[PDB]
Amino acid sequence: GGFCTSAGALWIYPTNCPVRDYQLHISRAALFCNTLVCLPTGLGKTFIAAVVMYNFYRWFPSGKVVFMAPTKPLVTQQIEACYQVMGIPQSHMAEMTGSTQASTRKEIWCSKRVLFLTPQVMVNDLSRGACPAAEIKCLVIDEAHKALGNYAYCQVVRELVKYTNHFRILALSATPGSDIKAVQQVITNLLIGQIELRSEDSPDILTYSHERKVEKLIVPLGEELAAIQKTYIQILESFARSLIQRNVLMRRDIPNLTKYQIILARDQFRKNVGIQQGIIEGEFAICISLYHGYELLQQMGMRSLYFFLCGIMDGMTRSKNELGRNEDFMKLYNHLECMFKFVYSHPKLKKLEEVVIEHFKSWNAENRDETRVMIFSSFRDSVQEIAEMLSQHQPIIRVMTFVGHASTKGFTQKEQLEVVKQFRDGGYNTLVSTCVGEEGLDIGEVDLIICFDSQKSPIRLVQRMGRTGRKRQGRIVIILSEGREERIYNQSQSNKRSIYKAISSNRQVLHFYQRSPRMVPDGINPKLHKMFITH
DNA sequence: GGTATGAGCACTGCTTAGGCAGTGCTCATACCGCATG
């Protein structure tokens, strides 16, 4: 399929940077079989992709190589980083996103050999015949753990296979899935023939990366929030009884239920008439909102609870009317209204402030290159509250929030990049980030990472810890409320080990795609050629 | 329920034109959630 016999004699490996065994072995593996590469962040998933893409570029000179990333900033970062490693002239490559008109993309597809794009552009260009589907010989998928359900990654492969089976897939993920079931879906969706995995624990990784120790700070909930929690549980009980009596909700202890368990109960209901549907849907929507509020109170604090409730109690939803007829709700809501110096709406926030102050004290005492602190909380109200709390210490602490595009106005792609550049240059020394700061964009190495919340899935914890590494031995602090939050953390670490074992096990836990094309003709055994690549 | 993201089209400012290059909007994805190999 257009394979260049002469180029097939060799596979070229860059020596610009010292050769690492794990990068040499994994690169070679990925040439001959569809591979999912799982390395810690900063240990060279991008380098391996560049090596693979450059050799496919050489081996299929009339073919195309495609690199997919989930965000526009990541596309730009990755084309730049891969350009530096590969021996491909700038004129043979292009970035393509929704910022390039579909009309222009057709000309870029035809004139370029390597394309870095968002997967939605690829889906659109395949369906509309702008992408010459048959000419694709290599497809690199970054953040490949996102290749679940009908995500654009899954759509690209399903559409491409209509036109050609003769391409290599390289998937890159530090965190292949939340569990085995998710890892199996990624393998199935992306036609993965094998996994090449190294952990922080891996000896061949320890050489090129400082081990980083996790500190846990357990914070008791305290009298004030305990008392509000106790009032909240009774409000929860009164609004959930209808679902207990309707038998749509199992009846499992009201205080121990989660918003996720009720969204599932609602979903199981929506697949099993008239006035009835309206009242049940209404009861479910009220309970899911209250249990959201309950989670905010336990994990984020009273200010987060208030702001969420204010969004509801600000139009006439049924939720607004019902909750408005409850005196305990309106008592609590009116109390939070009054409440909102700086108010410490969760004991975790006071503990977070102590840790950050002590870090800057200890750093400035050692007197000169500014320290960098990244704090992760999932909710926008928490991130703004944490930022306001730490703003009291300006300009010793120079805090900025890092949030997604949706409006608390939200940040555009351009505004996000300015905050990152400000963080890198020490304009800001402290970043408070939602999940947008966990994935892809090279923020830089950070001296202190703080996790304000915890999830049962291990993915986001590993991503958050990825923002510190070798260059400078970093510190990872995890602030947990005592009880549940401590168990969620213990579960995420157990789930991480479970996935590692399953991937590494001699027994076939995972079902790999067995029909990955060799791509190099069966006659040709390409020989390693190490060289200094010059542009 | 909130958190990201995306594309394509709307809208508007430019120093000098263009589907430029920005932000805004509507419509899609996905996750979270049992616990293990």
Numbering used by the authors: 73 to 344, 350 to 391, 395 to 420, 442 to 468, 474 to 513, 517 to 644
Source paper text:
FANCM is crucial in genome maintenance, functioning in the Fanconi anemia (FA) pathway, alternative lengthening of telomeres (ALT), and replication fork protection. FANCM recognizes branched DNA structures and promotes their remodeling through ATP-dependent branch migration. Here we present crystal structures of FANCM’s N-terminal ATP-dependent translocase domain (2.2 Å) and C-terminal FAAP24-bound region (2.4 Å), both complexed with branched DNA. The N-terminal translocase domain specifically recognizes DNA junctions through multiple key elements, while the C-terminal FAAP24-binding domain engages adjacent double-stranded DNA.
